Amino acid sequence: XXXXXXXXXXXXXXXXXXXXXXXXXXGYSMFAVGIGALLFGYWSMMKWNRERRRLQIEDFEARIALMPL
Amino acid sequence: MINILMLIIPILLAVAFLTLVERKVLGYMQLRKGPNVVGPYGLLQPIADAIKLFIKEPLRPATSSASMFILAPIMALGLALTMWIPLPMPYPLINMNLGVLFMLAMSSLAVYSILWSGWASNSKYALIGALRAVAQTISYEVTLAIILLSVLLMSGSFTLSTLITTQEQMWLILPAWPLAMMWFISTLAETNRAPFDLGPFALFFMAEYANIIMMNIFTAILFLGTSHNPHMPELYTINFTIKSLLLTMSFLWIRASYPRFRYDQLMHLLWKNFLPLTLALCMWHVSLPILTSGIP
16 A cells, blocks of 8 residues: 555635724724814813812912911 | 932833843744843843943944043933933922923933934044934924923923822823824934934943833823822822833834834924924914913
């Protein structure tokens, strides 16, 4: 009996298949989150600066109140 | 005054122990094993590099022009270490009258470190490439000043201590969404060797990697904060280090993942494209405290 190297292909490994595809981001939907984070960013920040004004006037009031200084 | 030595010696160790991080984290990116033979996980190698280069390694200068070449590493290491002083941290060492102005000044003078090295070599062959390396740093410092001002004009004065207090509930990444993207790129121009790349030669490594940590920390003040807590210094110290370490991973991410942008097209990304974008956002950031009340 002769024994040589046997042939096997099975699945053929798929000859040239695309793996690159669009994922997560679509296009217009990313701008809704992108610019949406900006509008949420300013509104949250400016409310803190209005709360800073409560401290600001109260800080300068200490100088006016102190005349024996 | 003992705290200055407690901000040079552990910092020089941080630049030394970077050699582990700069090729093990970079290693797993490239599927290779970094340090392993030298130590238990290679912890003995960072200090072993110091014994190799400082003591035994001799000098062979090209011409040695009296004062220069043995003055350029002093300007390199000196300016890199003095940048640690104005840093806000939980508590700053000798807090300046204005914070960020000192930060931009010592970085703009750090351009000299690569300038005097070009003058050290007598040959014309080296100085053309040296001036090209100056152009990589000098150009991005124009925008670096602009993006800084837009963050400052939103909230707080130049003082770095006030920048922690303004970030009480939400980070500055969300209001400054395109500006946060800029600080990931603009910082890499200062000899990081990720978008563009050009004894005493070993001392330049200890200075250039020191600026990498410096830009990681400075981004974690302008954009990160989470909490302040004056009563508990324990909670701030741990939480600040993790935020800075995550930015250190992103600095080594660009070095491995992305090729060089070319020197000519580095001036097409910036100047041609970035400078119209940064100033348009600067125009936007002038109107913001006027449109809605936002003055420190």
